Amino acid sequence: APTIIDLTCTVATCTHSSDFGGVLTLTYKTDKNGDCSVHSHSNVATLQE
Amino acid sequence: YEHSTVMPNVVGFPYKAHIERPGYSPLTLQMQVVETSLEPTLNLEYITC
């Protein structure tokens, strides 16, 4: 697994609609390229992927 | 998306309207008055010669 350090998130746009109406940008630092899993830890917002 | 503005009644003045929709990048559209005409409603009383 890749090691991820110093990660922050900023919200580009948000609109509380029925569809997926908000978009997130995450900044990170990694040692290798890889495929690994993202999650949200509340039901106030639902991710798509 | 509905928008409303007010533009001066001047021939040749370059009016530019700025639309800022929450989910999209801002848009600027240009309106210009090429020509104008104002006609009264006339009812003939008589003629002379």
Question: Across-strand partners of A27?
Answer: A8
**Largest CA-CA distance found in chain A, in angstroms, rounded:** 38
Q: Collect all residues of chain B within an 8 Å Cβ-Cβ radius of residue A12.
A: none
Q: B19 Cβ partners below 8 Å, 6+ apart?
A: B1, B3, B26, B27, B28, B29
Q: How many CA atoms lie within 13 A of B27 on its CB side?
A: 9
Shortest distance, CA A4 to any CA of chain B (angstroms): 30
Q: Does B22 touch chain A (CB under 8 A)?
A: yes
Q: Does B23 touch chain A (CB under 8 A)?
A: yes
Resolution in A: 3.0
